[PDB]
Amino acid sequence: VNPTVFFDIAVDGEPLGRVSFELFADKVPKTAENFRALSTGEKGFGYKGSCFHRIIPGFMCQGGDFTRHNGTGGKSIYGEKFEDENFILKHTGPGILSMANAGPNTNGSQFFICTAKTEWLDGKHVVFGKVKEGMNIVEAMERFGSRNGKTSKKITIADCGQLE
Numbered sequence: 539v540n541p542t543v544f545f546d547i548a549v550d551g552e553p554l555g556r557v558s559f560e561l562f563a564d565k566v567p568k569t570a571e572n573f574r575a576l577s578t579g580e581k582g583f584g585y586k587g588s589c590f591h592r593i594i595p596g597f598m599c600q601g602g603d604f605t606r607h608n609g610t611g612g613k614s615i616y617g618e619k620f621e622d623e624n625f626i627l628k629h630t631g632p633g634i635l636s637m638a639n640a641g642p643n644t645n646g647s648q649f650f651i652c653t654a655k656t657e658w659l660d661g662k663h664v665v666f667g668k669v670k671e672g673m674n675i676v677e678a679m680e681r682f683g684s685r686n687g688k689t690s691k692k693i694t695i696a697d698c699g700q701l702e
């Protein structure tokens with residue numbers, strides 16, 4: 539019953555592939571709903587055309603700034619920020635989808651996908667989903683990151699929406 543959403547990823551115009559995500563609405567319904575709605579654009583704004591602005595190989599890929607496209611922006615469907623819903627789910631391994639933030643209770647639209655177990659983030663970032671299909675695409679995106687996160691090409695959500 540959990541929603542499934544997809545991103546079609548391109549590297550400066552070159553199609554890379556589709557990543558799909560299960561959103562754990564059963565555990566974090568408010569956080570899952572925000573991501574679902576931003577992925578469909580049904581509130582009038584969202585992730586389509588935004589990039590993965592910070593990519594660190596062996597760690598994670600971060601994106602979701604559709605307001606400024608410079609890594610400082612983003613907003614939720616509830617307002618500029620919303621609470622950390624709960625920390626039941628942990629950063630257990632690759633594929634984990636979690637909220638980026640600037641401190642407690644500052645969730646907006648920015649998110650990241652883990653490419654490794656990142657347990658030191660447990661209790662600080664809200665985990666709310668996981669890659670279902672296309673983990674190979676996320677691994678491919680890593681080659682375009684670097685140790686300090688700066689990307690060598692713009693990794694774009696060319697299209698996105700909801701599958702189930």
Ligand SMILES: CO[C@@H]1CC/C=C/c2cccc(c2)[C@@H](C)OC(=O)[C@@H]2CCCN(N2)C(=O)[C@H](C)NC(=O)[C@H](C(C)C)NC(=O)[C@@H]1C
Pocket residue numbers: 592594598600608609610611637638639640641648649650686687
């Ligand atoms: C421009 O923004 C700045 C700087 C933020 C991060 C800088 C930075 C640079 C290099 C390496 C790393 C972080 C490594 C250690 O950590 C991550 O990659 C972590 C990994 C989990 C997701 N994530 N970034 C985050 O959630 C980070 C900390 N936060 C942000 O990106 C927020 C966004 C959501 C407004 N920005 C802010 O708090 C500021 C206004």
